[PDB]
Amino acid sequence: NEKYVVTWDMLQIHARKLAQRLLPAEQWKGIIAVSRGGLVPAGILARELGIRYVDTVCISSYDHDNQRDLKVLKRAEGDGEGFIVIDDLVDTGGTATAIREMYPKAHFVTIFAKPAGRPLVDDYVVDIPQNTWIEQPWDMAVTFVAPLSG
Amino acid sequence: NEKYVVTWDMLQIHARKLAQRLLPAEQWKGIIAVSRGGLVPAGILARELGIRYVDTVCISSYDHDNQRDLKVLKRAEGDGEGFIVIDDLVDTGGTATAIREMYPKAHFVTIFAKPAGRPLVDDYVVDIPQNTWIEQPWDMAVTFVAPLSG
Amino acid sequence: NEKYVVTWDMLQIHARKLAQRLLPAEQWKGIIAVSRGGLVPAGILARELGIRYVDTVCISSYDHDNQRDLKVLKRAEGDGEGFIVIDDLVDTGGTATAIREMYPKAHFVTIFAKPAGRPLVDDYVVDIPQNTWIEQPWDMAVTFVAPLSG
Amino acid sequence: NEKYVVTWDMLQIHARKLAQRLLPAEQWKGIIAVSRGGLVPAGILARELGIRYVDTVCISSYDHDNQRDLKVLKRAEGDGEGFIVIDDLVDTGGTATAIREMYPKAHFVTIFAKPAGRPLVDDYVVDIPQNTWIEQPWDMAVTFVAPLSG
Ligand SMILES: Nc1nc2c(ncn2[C@@H]2O[C@H](COP(=O)(O)O)[C@@H](O)[C@H]2O)c(=O)[nH]1
Ligand SMILES: Nc1nc2c(ncn2[C@@H]2O[C@H](COP(=O)(O)O)[C@@H](O)[C@H]2O)c(=O)[nH]1
DSSP states (O other): OOOEEOOHHHHHHHHHHHHHHTOOGGGOSEEEEEETTTHHHHHHHHHHHTOOOEEEEEEEEEEETTEEEEEEEEEOSSOOTTEEEEEEEESSOHHHHHHHHHSTTSEEEEEEEOTTTGGGOSBOSEEOOTTOOEEOGGGEEEEEOOOSOO | OOOEEOOHHHHHHHHHHHHHHTOOGGGOSEEEEEETTTHHHHHHHHHHHTOOOEEEEEEEEEEETTEEEEEEEEEOSSOOTTEEEEEEEESSSHHHHHHHHHSTTSEEEEEEEOTTTGGGSSBOSEEOOTTOOEEOGGGEEEEEOOOSOO | OOOEEOOHHHHHHHHHHHHHHTOOGGGOSEEEEEETTTHHHHHHHHHHHTOOOEEEEEEEEEEETTEEEEEEEEEOSSOOTTEEEEEEEESSSHHHHHHHHHSTTSEEEEEEEOTTTGGGSSBOSEEOOTTOOEEOGGGEEEEEOOOSOO | OOOEEOOHHHHHHHHHHHHHHTOOGGGOSEEEEEETTTHHHHHHHHHHHTOOOEEEEEEEEEEETTEEEEEEEEEOSSOOTTEEEEEEEESSOHHHHHHHHHSTTSEEEEEEEOTTTGGGOSBOSEEOOTTOOEEOGGGEEEEEOOOSOO
8 A cells, every 4th residue: 555656767677677578679570659658668668679660559538427438549550460569557457458459469568567457468577566556757756855853 | 078967857857847838738639759769758748748649750860971861660640730749859950850841730849959959949948069968868777886986 | 686776766765764763853862874885874864853963983894704804993982872873784784783882772773684684783674685785876877778689 | 046956866976076076085084074964975975985984073053032053063073184074065154164164174075056155165066056945865755746737
């Protein structure tokens, strides 16, 4: 239940561990970033793997009565063969399920995985408990905080 | 003209200053990132502006003496109307100008601009001298370094 | 047992967790830093606890096969009663034990502890395996590093 | 009037520029840190210069009627000959005046200086306007901040 704080430095350390596992870079046609969470990790992977072909898939949700379903705003074409598909984390994997099904032949990776989402991805770096909230660095700032005493 | 070190935290400060200028978010259809340098700034803008429609333009460029050859590897469709197109930095403004020919109605922004490129972008945050190399945080690591005195 | 990289931000998170345990600040007369490793954690504790009385103990230690020779370069007076004495890390606990002989009534704390040293300190925040080297942020820099694939 | 945010990384970059100017390290007997602001910078200098003799001077203030005066809580002995005395910043230099007078033969340096304090120190790294508040990294945390839009 204590939030897990992810600094930019640490995110890049984890992403570089993933990149090393994705060598040799020549096996890949490109990277598909899951917007928005995957954008930064994609940037790091593309740099480390020397990959210039980077595209995106953009999904959002909408409610109708008591239900909630996913909408595709934009997608890279194809079934993902030869691609890495990257998101920042998988939690329960609702979006990851949709993404898997659009790109069934991609290698689908995240930085973080919680237990209920873990089966949906092909690789990930860091295990996080289901009840832990992951605070990513694009959601944070270096900000004054009062001292613990006085 | 010692290199200018850009940490992740400072890059985000600069990008947030750009995002504030781009408010209200409702003026924009989406963001196009210039891969690869624009991917991280695009993620930051997309978070700050609440924009899930993020796409890419991927180009390879090679200098042959006084002329650049441009190869488009992948490009987002359309003329850019209603889009922000973001790259990390402009030096000569050559890439910006090429991208702007592809997307002549986009609002083209960077984080850093050297003097030659400043007039060739719609907005930028930080002035950098022409002969200063900018070292971006996706090209760096936190690494041991020997003491200045042994 | 790959080295464990400690960024400045993460060091401060850990030190704040230590500072919370040391509340209320009124229980303490002051802080003694073990130079040099304890200087940065001491600054953090002094800020968090509102303690302006900060002193140092400076020792040089050289291993000669199986025995250490200790030279006190400078030491804060007294037996440590009412003081926190802070060092960055404990490995064997040899330094801690020596310092504690000098200040037997101090409350001796570190940020990191390897298993051998854990019982030889009053409090610590982070467990580190015995054969893991901790790389502290005062020994590191943000530095260019080549891509994993060229 | 916009606060000047100092990240840990940037503080160390500035402190290393100062350390380079303080070479050769052999000219110094040791470092005196001005508590509390000087503790972190002292830690960095001591590492970079290979200096193990680090002591402190600790001053506080007290009011009496409409006046305000300084109190010495603890001080290193001597007139500072052969020492570096370091504080994080000089602003108006009230404390710096007292420190100068206690250690008239030290080399008194800071990282930051505002114009009214600048004449009191022997060297500093970064000029800061009088009306700018410097936010040091021991006063900050990496913390959630709401997005600029929505
Ligand atoms: N990291 C880095 N890349 C640069 C710098 N100057 C130019 N570049 C790269 O060189 C390309 C050419 O920039 P242009 O001259 O077209 O503005 C850009 O994609 C840019 O990423 C620099 O100072 N630092
Ligand atoms: N940076 C770093 N210093 C260490 C490590 N292990 C031991 N040291 C240094 O070696 C000294 C001996 O530690 P001890 O064995 O006395 O606990 C300590 O001052 C400590 O700073 C490590 O993993 N990282």
